[PDB]
Design a protein around this ligand. Structure first.
Ligand code: LYS
Ligand code: LYS
Ligand code: LYS
Ligand code: LYS
Ligand code: CL
Ligand code: CL
Ligand code: CL
Ligand code: CL
Ligand code: V
Ligand code: V
Ligand code: V
Lengths: 255, 254, 253, 254
């Protein structure tokens, strides 16, 4: 119930599973792949907490889903074909908004990032829900404006139907000249399959990533909590490409 | 569809199991009455499981029936849940054929160490139970037949109940079940389940129940029941078939 | 040097939480036994190597063969070589480490009671070195509460040498009832690999090592500690065979 | 005791491998040049392993020979070890018959995906290497033949060295081996081994070495070498058969 109670409980949940040594091994993996998964073997939150977060997200989707179907010029015209729930609607959730600022959760994850995780991001990008449900729905190749995202894989299709996360770490976002396909020609793609209930941390500014299009009608739902690193602060947003908040963004080209 | 399911299931099993590793599962099945197929030791492709669950979700929506009763043949333990009857489930081509698959039954017989025979009373070949209210439960009981494959289609968080509790190496005397005396004499093993798990159960000699939901949640299973040779030619007794008939003779008001 | 405590403290702090030590305390009470293996280390590699080397010298210099039966434990055998506690105590490394406030302070989170390095001078330490077929540390209990056992060298499991234990027992020296206790209680068998350590509740855990099925090498170091319940206890038994092979309870064979 | 081995081995492998799981080991062998048979993937029964190890330990005590040289056909990389020659090992009836077992060779051909032919130069059929001293090593090299089954009979702890380092998808040019250049162009995969492991190695296209021992310790292997079709009627060139002839022209002193 009380926000101090979830923090107090989460602190114990993590202390039952992690040591400074094992977190340092997760930090190595995060640096190597841009990505670290918390699955059935290595949980991040109590199952009752994730259940509460999923049910709140199910409600926001029912009440506020907005279909997007566009190409984004700042990422080489890669597609966005999904429904979204905007950040300002998600922020009305006391659970999601407080958990996304938990000193316990941010303090734990900073041992994986090896730097301070700062909950000071543009108010249109604190949270995002994506809800894919039709064949060929996809979150096309892109980067993030900020350093970090904790992605909740709330509902995942069987791997045979797509929806895996593909990633190329150790890259960067040149919005004037993204060179996405030339980068794929130069770099190996790592494909990360996900199961419902998984969570994963993603270094979104230096990891080029997409979700594999759904091969048939199927449900893929995630919650993205975005955070900044120090390098993101006092840096100006550019690109006029904030399509999830504004489907009429200058860089969005509708289909 | 078609015979492609069996051919693909065979490959899926051959990628994961060997005679040596199946014999190790057989030892566990015999020690615990129970073996679990979880995220690390899967039993069916996720695509196949998904199709089964969608079939069951539809059957629940069209045919679910509430049950709220005590069964006198099991010490008046409760049954509080919704069910879908075997004869409705049987209309599913997917579930009925998979339940008779020579690939699936032949694999699982390496665990039972005896032939799994798909010839059971037509009111008990399949069952779906669907719990969703606080205190919903499948109270302590045994099964009339030797085997069940349980699909843990949807499980609540462990903190909300819904685990399977089991005491292997028991027997069901319907005139004197001795459930609470048996618990005083034997240790209880509690098995937590997660959505997507499956598990094989020795239902005739394992006393078992589902831990009641501690709050409104959702717990949904599909039960595929099979016979062993010892179950054939034997007559059903007890007038206690509460899932097919809510007013079976043994069923009592709460 | 004298920096072991600083090194050990940092080593343990990186691998344990109070919550994870509480899980070990549960296991210790339930089994009388808790094993520090590759997944749950207790000392750095450098310290293990140093302790093992010191013990390897002590064996080369002071090994003493024992082959007897002990009447206070039902005439169960002792077939092994030993190095007496007084020889081992001359090691500044082993004696210092066996009194480290970091080691004893951490392990007290497992025992859940103070660990007291106030033990009879002939039982503070023991090395046992089994080398021949049928060598065994037969069924027995300890006079004190606690032992930290260093599995310095262990044979492959197929050659024997595992620890067998039955927790929640006690040592009646006039009527040990070992075989009758085995008939009433389940035996837990614990295999060990070289470099393992384990903590043992020696006064309430009946235990033995499974005899060697063939000539092999099994070498351990025993640091024995007291609990409060042990202090000012009168040692009874005339059975301290490892310090004195002519103890009265020792029947040779 | 000679046709019994073939029969006992076939049943041992039938219980632990399916065609599908062998196909997965073939992918790894192709990709890495290397497949490990460890506790999770046994290749021979423990009794047979023990018999071979005891035989090799006798051959070592009786016939071990020190080698301490640089090999000019592999860029002067070192060979610092003891060896037992193929001629002495060949007198073992157990090792000899096992190395030609149609069961063993037939099983492993599911991993190589081609026939494994026990038709190699008599001086290379078998080899024991026995490393005992700090900086003992089998320096960077290739094999003249396609295949080797290595028995990791005794391995030091990983912290003391003795791992197998490998670069697959290479070739051995004995006039210009370009070892260090190849290391600059390619990633090195390091394979730790434990006593009791076996591993299959594609010796002609995998550049490999053993990491030098960082202190006195014991590392003992048995190499069974086989040919593939590409190797039949092979011209052996280089004057570099240092294990069999320490006065080989290509063998230099340190
Ligand atoms: N920059 C991302 C949007 C991230 C929204 C959530 N932080 C894209 O181009 O799709
Ligand atoms: N005998 C069980 C019912 C099993 C029905 C499905 N095989 C009970 O009393 O609850
Ligand atoms: N009481 C043990 C000897 C323990 C000596 C070392 N603490 C026995 O009878 O074998
Ligand atoms: N070609 C190897 C010798 C392998 C001998 C055993 N087949 C080397 O240069 O060391
Ligand atoms: Cl992003
Ligand atoms: Cl049942
Ligand atoms: Cl003792
Ligand atoms: Cl070679
Ligand atoms: V992204
Ligand atoms: V003892
Ligand atoms: V080689």
């Amino acid at each position: 119930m009380n926000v101090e109670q979830i923090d107090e409980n989460l602190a114990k949940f993590l202390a039952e599973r992690y040591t400074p040594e094992s977190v340092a091994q997760l930090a190595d993996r995060f640096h190597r792949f841009g990505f670290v998964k918390f699955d059935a073997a290595n949980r991040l939150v109590p199952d009752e907490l994730q259940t509460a977060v999923r049910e709140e997200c199910d409600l926001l989707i029912e009440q506020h889903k907005e279909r997007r179907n566009l190409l984004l010029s700042t990422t080489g015209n890669t597609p966005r074909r999904m429904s979204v729930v905007k950040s300002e609607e998600i922020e009305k959730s006391e659970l999601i908004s407080t958990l996304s600022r938990s000193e316990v959760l941010l303090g734990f994850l900073a041992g994986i990032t090896r730097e301070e995780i700062i909950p000071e991001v543009s108010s249109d990008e604190r949270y995002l829900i994506t809800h894919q449900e039709f064949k060929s729905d996809t979150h096309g190749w892109h980067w993030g404006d900020y350093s970090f995202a904790l992605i909740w894989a709330l509902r995942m299709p069987p791997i045979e139907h797509g929806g895996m996360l593909q990633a190329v770490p150790h890259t960067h976002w040149d919005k004037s000249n993204p060179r996405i396909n030339q980068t794929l020609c130069e770099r190996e793609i790592n494909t990360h399959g996900l199961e419902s209930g998984d969570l994963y941390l993603l270094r979104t500014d230096t990891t080029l990533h997409r979700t594999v299009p759904l091969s048939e009608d199927s449900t893929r739902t995630i919650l993205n909590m975005t955070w900044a690193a120090k390098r993101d602060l006092e840096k100006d947003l550019v690109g006029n490409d904030r399509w999830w908040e504004n489907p009429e963004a200058e860089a969005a080209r509708a289909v």
